[PDB]
Every structure is written in C-alpha cells, then in structure tokens.
Design a protein around this ligand. Structure first.
Ligand code: SF4
Ligand code: SF4
Ligand code: SF4
Lengths: 630, 630
C-alpha cells in the first residue's frame, strides 16, 4: 500500500511479484540511491570529453572540462530537454496536419466531423469562409499551417499570433522569445545546446521559453484544434475509470499512446467487427484507454479509462488484456517482457517506435481501415487463447463525467446565461464562491507515491472553493479517485459546491457538476490555455493577473517540462511536485522561480509536499485576488 | 611533455599555472576519475524519473526505470547526440543560405566571388546555366534549397540526391534512411529519443544513419558549396601555423569559431583599417585563426592558423592577443575568465552564443561592415593597453601549404594529364605507389595527449604510402607539426614520395607536394566526400570498395559523431581514437563495429592506440585492394 493510493495497485503488484515479473516500482527501488549529480543537474555529457560533474558544496570541481559552470550546465540541459518535449508535441501535431492535408486531397479514411470547429479555427487564422467550399477551407488552412513549418524569416509563426492575446505578444516580443518556425527553432536550440555554445544562463532560459512557446502553439494548440475538426469537439460524457472497466466476458483491447489517429480507428472497427467477437465466444469488444490516447477516446467516444502512466504494466497483470495497441510516447518498453508472459499481444504501429517482442502492424492513412481490422482480428484470435486461471480483474472502478472542452463548458454555462456564458463563472469568482481555478496536469513519477500527490493536492484545493481542471495522467488519477463523479461535489467547499450544483441543475443533469473538470489529453492543455485567455479577456486583464495556477504534481516526461515552460510563458505560476534537474545552480533556480515573475509574469514553484504546495497555491491565488481589488 | 606534443604548450601551460589560471588540462585532472556509467553510455536522464544507470559488468539492475535496457539507452543516446551534431552543421549551412538569398535580393555586404562554382553547382541542382543572369541563378538556387527545409512529403532531399552516387541512393532506399527534410528529421529523431519511444536498437541506429545523411548533405555539403560561391573556391596557398604567427609589434586579432561570414569580414576590414593601427603605434594588424573558422580564412585568404581546439586558452596566455572575435561552436566558456586577466577583449557576435564577461557585438548581414569596423577598432584600442611584461610569444611555427579543394586538386593534377586529370591519381593507386588515401578529421580531446594521436597516426600512414587528407582540428595538428610543409614528403613512403614530387614541379612549385592535403574545415569534409565520389565513379565502383578509410583520433564534439556516422553512411570504415559512450552495450557496439558493414558498407572501428589503429587502418586498405585485385 506504500506504492500507491490507487486501490487496485497492491494486489496487481503482488500478483506480478509472485509471477516473477519486473515492474516500474521494482526497477526504481533497484536504482536507489540515485546519482545526486544527475538529480540536481550537475552532470554534463554533451561532449565526449565528459562526463563532467560539479560539487555543489565547494570541494570538488566547480566547472566542466570546457569551463561550463553550474549555471551553464543546468540551463543548457533544461533547454535541450525542453526542446525534446517540444519536438514530441510538434511531431504529434504535424502528424495530424498530414491527415488534414490528406482530407483536403480527398481521402476516405478521415473527414471533417466538426465543421463548426473548422469555421471557428479558420476564422481565427484569418480565412474568409464566405463563398468557399469545405474542401477550399481545409485547403487554405493547411497552406497557412505549413507556411509556419517553412517560414525562413523573422515573422512569428501564424499559429502563435492568431491564438495568443495581445499583451502576451508584446511581452514575448520585448523579451525576444517569439518563435518563427517550430522545426527551425528546434534545430537552432538543439544546436545552441552543443558544446562550446551559449554560456549565458539568462539567454539560454530565454530560449527555453521560446521552445515552450513552440510546444504550446505548434504542438498543443495545433493538435487540439485539428483533432477536434477531424474527430469532433468533445461534449460531456459519462463512463468509468480504473482497471475495473475490463470485462472477462468481452474481448479486451487497450489503446495506449497519444495520437488518436490510431485509437479512433480502433474504436470505429471494434464496433463494426463485434459480430466476429461474438462468433468467437464473447459478449462483445470492450475498449479501454491508457495515457493520453485513452483520454482522447474518452473525451470523444466515452471509452473508459484503464489506468495512467505508472500502472500501464499492471494492466496486463490483470490477465484479461487480449491486445494492447500502441503508437508513440510514454510506452514502457517493459511491456514486451510482460506481454511475453501472457497470451496478450503487444502491437506497435509507428515507424519511429518499435519494441522487440511486439508485433509491428504498419498503420498509415492509406491503410488505416485494413490495419485497424487486422489489429482487432488479432485481438479476437488472442481472446481465445486466454488463460482464465491467470486473470484477476479488480472490482474497483469509478464513475467519471468528462468531455469538458471549452466548447462544452460554454454550452453548460449558457444554460444559466445564454448571451454571456462566462458571466456566471466570472461573477462567482469575483464574489468568492470560487476562490480560483487550478490546472493539475502531468504524468506519474515513481519518486512520488502513485496518484497520491494528484489526489491530495486537489482535495485540499476544492475544499477551499478552488475549481480544478485537469488533463493527462493527472486526469486519470482524479478519475480513478472518483473526483469526476458528481457525488464528489460534497468534498468541495460550500461556495464551490453551490456553483457546481447551479450549473448541474440548470442542465437537467439531476446532480451537480463534479469538482474536477476533465479537459482532455496533454495536448488538450491548450484548451486550458484557451480558457484562461477567455477569462482574462472577459475581465479586461492578462492571464498573469488571474487568480489561477498550474501544477504538475508527478511529472516525468520531457513533454511536461515544455508544457510547464509554456504555462510559465503564458504568465501562470507553475507548480512542480518533482524536483527538476536544475537545483544544483543557485542562479538558474532563482531565475526560474523568482526572476521569471518580473520578466514574463509566471514562475516555477517547486514543492514536494502536497499540503505545503496546496497552501502555497492558495496564497498565490489570494495574492492575485488582492491585486484585482476583489 | 605529458600534456601535448605541440611544442608551445608546456611553457604556455606553466605560464598560465604561474598566473593562477586554470586550463582545460587542469579541469580534466579535477574530474578524474570520471563516472563509469556515463563513459560507457549506461546512464539515462531522458526523463525526470532518472537518472537511471546500468552496471557495465551486468550485476545490479539491467533495465532503466521505464524498462529500457543497455541496448536502448546507448542507441537512444547516440541518436540524440548525432541529431544534435546534425543540427549544428545544418544551422551553419542555413546561415550561409540566408546570405545567398540576400545576394539574390541585392545586398551590398556579400556577392558571388566564384561564379564558376556557382554555375557548376547550379548544373548539379538541375538548373540550366546558359542564357540566364547571375541573379536569376541565385534566386533559382535558393528556392530549390529552401524547398528541402520545407518538404512535407516522402521525397528525399534534393541536396542529398543531386550529390550522391546511384549505388548509395539505392543502398539507402532499401535501408529506409533517406532524409526528406533536415529540419523535420531533427524534430522527428529528437522526438524518437524522448522517453517511451523506440526500443529497437537497430531501428534507432538506422535513424542515426539518416541523421548522418542530414548532417553531411544538408550541413557539410551545403555549407561548402555556398561558401565557395560567396567567398571563392580555395586554391593552393603558402602560410604558417602554430602560435609563433603572433607578432608583438602588430595588433593581433584572432578569429575563433566556425562560420566564415564573420571571419571573412574581419579579414576584409582588418586590411582596410591598417592605417589606424599604424597611427596607434603598431606595425599593422596581424590575423590568426583558431579552429574551423581559422581553416576557412586559411583556405581562402592564407591567414595562418594560431592553434586548434584544446590549446585555445593558451593563445590568450601569450599576452599578445589583443582581441578574440567569436561566433559559434567549440568555444570554451573559460575564455572569458582568461581574457579577464589580460587586456584581451573577447567578443561574441551571434544571438545564440553569449558569454558573460565577453563583450557582445551583434553581427548581421546588413551591419556586417559596420560591426566589423567596430570590432577591429576595439582591438586597436586594446593593443594600446597591452602589458609587455606579460607577453610571451613562442618562437615555434611551421610552413603550411593548404587550399587543396577538389577543384584545386584536379587542376594540380591537370598539369600532369590535361585530358584526363584524375588518371595520374588513379594509376598510382592501382600500381601501389599510393596504397590508399585516408582522411583524418575531428577535434582535440583532453582524454588524449594533445595532437599525439593525430601526428602519430599520419606518420605511419604516409610511411606506408598512404596519402592523407585532413580537415578541422586534425588539420591544425598536422599543420603545426610541419606535415603540410613540402619538406615533410621525406617522411612519406618512397613510393608515395615520387607522385608528390611529380605534382610539385609539374605545377612549377619546385618543392614536392606535402604528404598531408589540407582540404578545409569540418564542413569541408564534403570535399573529401566529393573526391571519394569522383574517384569511385572513375573506377565504376562504390565508395565502400575504394582503398580508403576515415579517422577521428581525438574527437570530442557531437558534430564529429554526426560526421563519423556520415562517413560510415558513405561506406567508409571510420576509426575512433576516443572510446564512445556506447561500449557499455555489447549488442549496440557490435552493430556499429560489425553488423553495419553488411548493411551500409562502412563501420566504426574503436582503437585508442595510434600504432594499432594505423596497422588496422592499413590492414583494412590492402584487403579492399585485394577485392579490387590490384
Ligand atoms: S560540454 Fe563541457 S561540461 Fe559538457 S561534457 Fe563537454 S566538457 Fe563536459
Ligand atoms: S548522472 Fe552523470 S555522474 Fe551520475 S551516473 Fe549518470 S553519468 Fe554518472
Ligand atoms: S527514459 Fe527510462 S532509462 Fe531514461 S531516465 Fe527515464 S526511466 Fe530512466
């Protein structure tokens, strides 16, 4: 029970140990104690003269072989890892961009499922949609976006300019952190982190901010916009979470990864090939999602969430996973060893991600339907070899109400006020019924008790009338904890509980809205950004003035560093539950946590205790409230 | 003595030690012993769950926290670092591309100084040279190149396809390693190295090969082409090397870095402002070059080479360096603390490379002349403040003949055979007078006795009648040792000495050709590639079959890893004199040293001893000679 607060973990972990299967919790214990030079950021291997390390306490070397000090080594490493997290989101968004162009060229595998989103995004990009066919609007949209990936001049990329408020554009301009072309910025910054380059810690951090902007607008914002257009804007849905949503009677297919280009097709063809599953001796095809692609088909298709990042291995330990299909990012390579001990088939689909011991099924837009059919047909084959003596499906599962895109939030608020939908939300923030709103994002990290920080932070926040929106694996944690159940409004403060109830009864939902609003996947952090921009514009202020905060309680991936930097660049104080590899430098840590506030509005807040973090986040919100004369 | 074979280092080191200035040799001593996990490549920090380390002897954990094994950790790290080195050369070649585009738009800072190179490259790119103007050709050339940085399709790079033999194009197509877009391949590969991505070591190395092809054709080849066009193809020159080229009576300005867009303008405006130095009480303005940018002004302006990478700090220790101007790459940040102890002014010029303590003069195309005029004037100001009591200029220097571009080599060969200029070189290879030709490239590395590996490897090679071409800091080492002196032919084998004499007097040089051919900077390693391609086509054969080999005796930068991967991609066995962070995994090391030969023809060869490496590189050529039956 010391591993996690998720109730299903101990039994599934003990079941894995009895079978001699290595889990993420065992490999961490085997690494402790971890290297102190790497944890603090005082180790450098950016050239083959290294490794070089720096003694923070003044006895060993105070510079690398090239002469890099702690302020250089730490800041240079932060820029390279933020650049890498940005490259992940950009390459993700770029993948969806290819399908949008393939829709413009007339493909039958995908289509424009949300023309309302198309007209709205096209209007944001400056496209005049009058007298234009849908195919001409998609054609012109792809041309504008590709020009960002081809821009060779000093012009800021269009997808940033069209989606950012004016005050942010002026602040980023006077700091010189505006990105011009996402691919070019990734190449320039990666060049800037090679040996014998930038030795200015401020100039490096100023470039780290620019790649956070690349990540937020060429990665998060672009992906969410195009994914809503192609697959539909999420609207409120009811379903369940945690590994109890697996069914022994059904064929169990788990989708894992990030890009819904694969998981939407698996959901489509799981429904159409369900007769073949019954002919094999099963009630149907049960679908569950792990990580962000699980959040995608949760927000659009109501597919229940299996589990988050740290417990992806234990999903197969249930013995009921017949197939797990996978694309990119956050896929533990250990799943091949774990699926080898079972009938479970692990399937990889992307050319840049292969796992020895996993069947590779090439998935392209041309072959999306036939590759999807083969994958679930492999799962129907795999269901019949299942060993019932090795299945253990936990009883724990929680009710979740998700699908809260900005479009869905406005529609729910329009029941109270049709002309000014944000006004009921803003008036209650002003009155004090809602102290502030906090975005809890990020992954799981074995250094933190699994889901423990996510849940403990949010419970302390909603108790103080602090609305919580969430994405990614932080959303999985709050989902399995029952905090997206409408019944959880009892755990929120009376001011917040009244507002949640008022919105719920005005939508004829019977009960109140849950205290935690699920706003989608990691890329759907752009929705959160779009929301606080809309709130700030309503109040005639900047997001740096809003009584808000962001938090990554258990982050692990380089994508979280980029997102955190993006939120900092957006003017939002960003809390970090895990110690970043930067604390070895006094200057860099002071810049990222104090100097950044006067520079750009936001700052990082490092706090490993959930209760200390919650108290600090609430004090930051009250400070913003006091400056707003509330 | 123990530190270096460069004769000027010990006295300059003791002079720095006397003054209390820590050098690169000092900081390397303070790091010993270095972490065994990083040295072997068995340490990962690609996520904030780390650092994860694996025992090289295989005792403790053998998988990372995410489950990544030693094969995944080393190969994933190798791809990220090769991708990092590819972004350095691509960003270099991209800066020269912007200048070429400005010439098409009518700038007065630069122009086409070698119209014949321009017309030869235009023909290679498919441009019909005749009956169109120079501005037309430049504009047509720029659009073809920017298309490569904008290609969203599966079509290979135009710059790779136009400069590759058909066998390499066919071999790379089967391996799926053809690059499409240099900027996109960096983003996609950097994405492929984040956590939870590719777990296939072979698939990761196949992408490393692709990023080597990005580095060679979108970085090395593109830079060398457009720099010859803008500044002139190098032709044979006579000059000097080593730190004896600093003169106490002159204003000594050292250019340091890699991009000749700055050093060419400094050379231009150091001559035009010569009178202001004489008015300041000086004999004139003496220019010397450190690292690759010194090689650039060496090949085109005859500027002497001051020193290479490891001894860049000791140049300021001579007390005569009045100003050191710097752009990008391989710049030790310790230079600011060392210049702070002198009148020397360190000057940074590029926005991605600033160094606290060094003055910053922003260098752009439209302000190239103005910024250059300002910079040498700063040196004239600093000269008048030079302390003569702390000046110690070594007397050692060497006679250097360089400028051996592919164009310069063939016309020196055209004197011996005007109709078929390459015939004398080919016939002496098939006869045995030249056993083969070997390229020595790369930087310095404090892990190796300074220049000891470079010189020792070349002495035995030319002794065995192996012609040697070199670039980068390997060229600096051989230049200071007098191996580019015509007298050094005496050290070459008796069979190889004859062809050197038959080329010198045939060009009315009198002195025999040096056994070492300086072919330029590290981007000028494409010249070596252009020569190998020409030689292989003359023999109707693939470069993997030529009696050739490459060597990085003392590499350190990630740019050398990229170039080494490009050489291996060119079918050339690449020797490595420094242990790469890869040996911790036997499977990955065996793929790079053995399995790669069957796939692509080339392979890496790790050998820390110069005599065993020489014997091994020599033992590799006769085997290739036997396969040709010579
Ligand atoms: S860049 Fe400097 S600190 Fe980093 S590994 Fe190389 S020598 Fe060491
Ligand atoms: S972080 Fe650095 S010092 Fe620590 S194990 Fe890794 S290579 Fe060694
Ligand atoms: S990627 Fe895997 S091996 Fe690397 S630090 Fe993260 S958990 Fe460890």
């Amino acid at each position: 029970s010391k591993l996690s607060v998720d109730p299903v973990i101990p039994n599934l972990y003990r079941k894995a140990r009895e079978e001699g299967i290595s889990t993420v919790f065992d490999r961490y214990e085997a690494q402790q104690p971890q290297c102190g030079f790497g944890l603090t950021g005082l180790c450098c291997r950016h050239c083959v003269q290294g490794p070089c390390r720096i003694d923070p306490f003044g006895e060993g070397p105070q510079a690398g072989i090239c002469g890099a000090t702690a302020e250089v080594i730490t800041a240079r490493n932060l820029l390279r890892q933020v650049t890498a997290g940005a490259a992940a989101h950009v390459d993700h968004a770029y993948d969806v961009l290819e399908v949008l162009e393939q829709i413009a060229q007339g493909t039958e595998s995908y289509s424009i499922k949300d023309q309302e989103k198309l007209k709205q995004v096209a209007f944001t990009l400056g496209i005049d949609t009058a007298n234009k066919t849908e195919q001409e609007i998609v054609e012109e949209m792809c041309q504008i976006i590709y020009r960002d990936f081809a821009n060779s001049g000093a012009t800021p990329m269009t997808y940033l300019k069209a989606n950012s408020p004016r005050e942010r554009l002026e602040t980023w301009e006077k700091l010189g952190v505006l990105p011009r072309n996402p691919d070019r910025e990734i190449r320039e910054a990666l060049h800037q982190t090679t040996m014998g380059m930038d030795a200015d810690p401020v100039n490096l951090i100023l470039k780290t901010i620019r790649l956070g902007l690349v990540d937020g607008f060429a990665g998060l914002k672009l992906a969410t916009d195009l994914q809503d257009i192609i697959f539909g804007t999420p609207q409120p849905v009811v379903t369940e979470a945690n590994l109890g949503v697996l069914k022994e009677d059904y064929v169990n297919i788990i989708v894992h990864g990030h890009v819904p280009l694969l998981s939407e097709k698996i959901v489509e063809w799981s429904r159409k090939l369900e007769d073949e599953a019954k002919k094999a001796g099963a009630k149907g095809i049960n679908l569950a999602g792990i990580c962000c692609t699980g959040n995608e088909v949760l927000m659009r298709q109501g597919v229940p969430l299996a589990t988050n990042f740290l417990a992806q291995e234990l999903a197969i330990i249930t013995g009921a996973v017949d197939l797990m299909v996978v694309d990119v990012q956050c896929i533990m390579p250990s799943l091949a060893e774990i699926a080898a001990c079972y009938h479970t088939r692990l399937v990889t689909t992307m050319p840049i991600v292969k796992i020895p011991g996993a069947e590779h099924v090439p998935f392209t837009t041309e072959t999306a339907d036939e590759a999807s059919q083969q994958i679930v047909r492999m799962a129907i084959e795999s269901y019949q070899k299942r060993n019932p003596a090795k299945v253990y499906i936990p009883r724990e599962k929680a009710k979740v109400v998700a699908g809260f895109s900005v479009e869905a939030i406005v529609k729910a608020l329009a029941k109270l006020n049709p002309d000014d939908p944000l006004k009921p939300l803003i008036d209650n923030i002003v009155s004090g019924n809602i102290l502030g709103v906090v975005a809890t994002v990020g992954c799981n990290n074995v250094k933190v008790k699994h889901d423990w920080f996510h849940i403990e932070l949010v419970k302390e926040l909603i108790k103080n009338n602090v609305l919580v929106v969430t994405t990614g694996c932080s959303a999985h944690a709050l989902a399995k904890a029952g905090l997206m159940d409408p019944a959880a409004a009892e755990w929120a403060g009376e001011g917040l509980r009244a507002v949640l109830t008022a919105i719920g009864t005005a939508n004829d939902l019977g009960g109140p809205l849950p205290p935690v609003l699920h706003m989608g996947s990691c890329v759907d952090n752009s929705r959160i950004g779009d929301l606080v921009i809309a709130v700030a514009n309503y109040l005639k202020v900047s997001p740096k003035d809003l009584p808000i905060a962001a938090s990554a309680p258990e982050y692990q991936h380089e994508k979280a560093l980029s997102i955190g930097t993006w939120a900092v660049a957006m003017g939002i104080m960003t809390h970090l539950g895990v110690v970043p590899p930067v604390v070895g430098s006094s200057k860099v840590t002071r810049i990222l946590t104090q100097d950044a506030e006067a520079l750009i509005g936001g700052k990082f807040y490092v706090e490993t205790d959930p209760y200390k973090a919650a108290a600090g986040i609430i004090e930051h919100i009250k400070a913003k409230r006091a400056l707003l004369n509330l």
